[PDB]
Design a protein around this ligand. Structure first.
Ligand SMILES: [Cl-]
Ligand SMILES: [Cl-]
Ligand SMILES: [Cl-]
Ligand SMILES: [Cl-]
Ligand code: NA
Ligand code: NA
Ligand code: NA
Ligand code: NA
Ligand code: NA
Ligand code: NA
Ligand code: NA
Ligand code: NA
Lengths: 178, 178, 178, 178
């Protein structure tokens, strides 16, 4: 029985390029987390309490997603490498602009997973593609959700009354098409 | 065992300037109470039932805060001096104007507590600073709440539909960012 | 009514040096969070499942403490500034060494709060000292807890059997003197 | 409607090399089952009751996994071919040695699934890759579990006291990092 790079018994070696890609993806999700925190703060500063609560929950969820990846590296007997985290964007001219950045961030998170997925396919790492499959499924749902929230905010067309209605929807947990 | 100015056994004498400041602060909170009553009446006159219910509750709460201070003077064996109460402001041109006065009143209530706090610090009255600490904490929460209500009303920008939505939030007890 | 730097109604202006200190302290707690995450990973890599679970919970708690501070700045109508986050330490020669770093991190977190506290005292910001008081209380409890865990691990003197016993204590939630 | 090799209606023909690989994999899991039975006996002979209970359960689980594969061949209208089963290994010099064989067996079971998976990919048999995906996921979890048990036993470094503690963990069902 061989020992893996993190010292645990090694079921199968992992290509170092794939390992680097997973460590980088963990940073992408940690950065999404602090971005959603920044977005929750921006909404709280404008009394958009429902949007604040929504993004506060998204920040915690994104952090949990990042930790899920750290656990996979542990399970594969690979080293983790927690990286420097850039400061998030913190200023937006409107809720519609913020929601566009949020949608883009979710899509970019999926693109990162897709990049890791293609690398695992090139390396015939079926543990990793299997591990990623449900995370891609979750990303489909999150993209659908964030397209819904962005589209609904854009429909409001900057009207405060409509944005207050949507804010209350979010406070109630009405955050998807259902 | 010495007797305090109100006749009870005296644990520690209080500086007369600090006593005067506490008696004056009791008047500040009694005045906030009747101001919130006046604000509840103004809202009821315009069918803003949720704002009316909110300010009716705030008036009762502010009175309770004033009585809490009268109990502290009793506990310190100091005399109370319930003072003449000015008539409140009763006319506003808009809900946004009323909410600005409400926020100012809360901030001014905190400033009064801060004034008493600094006097107790100068007199090394640690009973009084300890007594005031949780009241300052409550003031932080109330300032955050009234900034939320004022900011949300200003976001409405005088639109009746948005103000009706916010009114219903208040009727439901949705009065903070949460 | 004046508007604060984050745009909300302003109850009382805050000294920019104190604001900078609070923003820096938020970074200190975010850094403690990712450090505890790194520590949980190190323990998981060595099958110390109870220590892994403990530090995983501490990472989430420290993040919550950081967000509590962001909410205070919102309440004071001050801007948040979420900063770049350094990479955590990730390598230790022993559990005793890791636990010493953990204790040091908790003590350093308290020192940061103490620094902010003294600045607020110099600026007579009683809202901020009142806000910090319960956080200092929590820090006392955490220092007592981490001295307990470090002391118990040092008592084990590197014996695997004793460290396995302590690991199981932590898995069961037995993490304090009680 | 065509009839498959086992006589049932045939949804889609299967490549004979892939069929042979699945039949061989069923033997691999049946062999893992009797190996875990042998391991449970070895532990019972040394009064390691928790390890005995653990491996007794693993033997039954591995058999269930093998039968799950026989059901898939039935569903694909393919013939099963239950093969001669070699005698398991039955002697180990230590618990650490046994646990290393156990980890190796789990990793080798995954390698067999990976071999079948690559053959299905080469034959564009998407039913089979979909069928195998959750089994690979389970293998990730089992490899993580057996690395945990092996690593914890190695940490004990042959000390009876530590091995008795771990034995009791296993009796209680504490068999993973959690
Ligand atoms: Cl907008
Ligand atoms: Cl208005
Ligand atoms: Cl140690
Ligand atoms: Cl051994
Ligand atoms: Na990387
Ligand atoms: Na795939
Ligand atoms: Na007076
Ligand atoms: Na004090
Ligand atoms: Na700073
Ligand atoms: Na103080
Ligand atoms: Na075969
Ligand atoms: Na596939």
């Amino acid at each position: 029985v061989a020992q893996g790079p993190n010292g645990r018994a090694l079921a199968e070696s992992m290509n170092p390029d794939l390992l680097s890609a997973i460590q980088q993806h963990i940073s992408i999700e940690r950065y999404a987390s602090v971005t959603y925190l920044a977005m929750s703060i921006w909404c709280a500063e404008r009394e958009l309490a429902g949007f604040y609560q929504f993004f506060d929950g998204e920040a915690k969820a994104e952090q949990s997603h990042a930790v899920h990846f750290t656990q996979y590296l542990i399970a594969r007997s690979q080293s983790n490498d927690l990286q420097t985290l850039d400061a998030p964007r913190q200023n937006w001219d409107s809720l519609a602009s913020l929601m566009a950045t949020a949608f883009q961030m979710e899509a970019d998170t999926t693109s990162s997973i897709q990049s890791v997925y293609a690398l695992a396919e090139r390396n015939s790492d079926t543990r990793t593609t299997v591990f990623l499959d449900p995370l891609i499924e979750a990303q489909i749902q999150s993209e659908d959700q964030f397209a819904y929230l962005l589209g609904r905010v854009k429909f409001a067309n900057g009207d405060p009354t409509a944005l207050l209605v949507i804010d209350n929807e979010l406070r109630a947990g009405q955050t998807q098409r259902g």
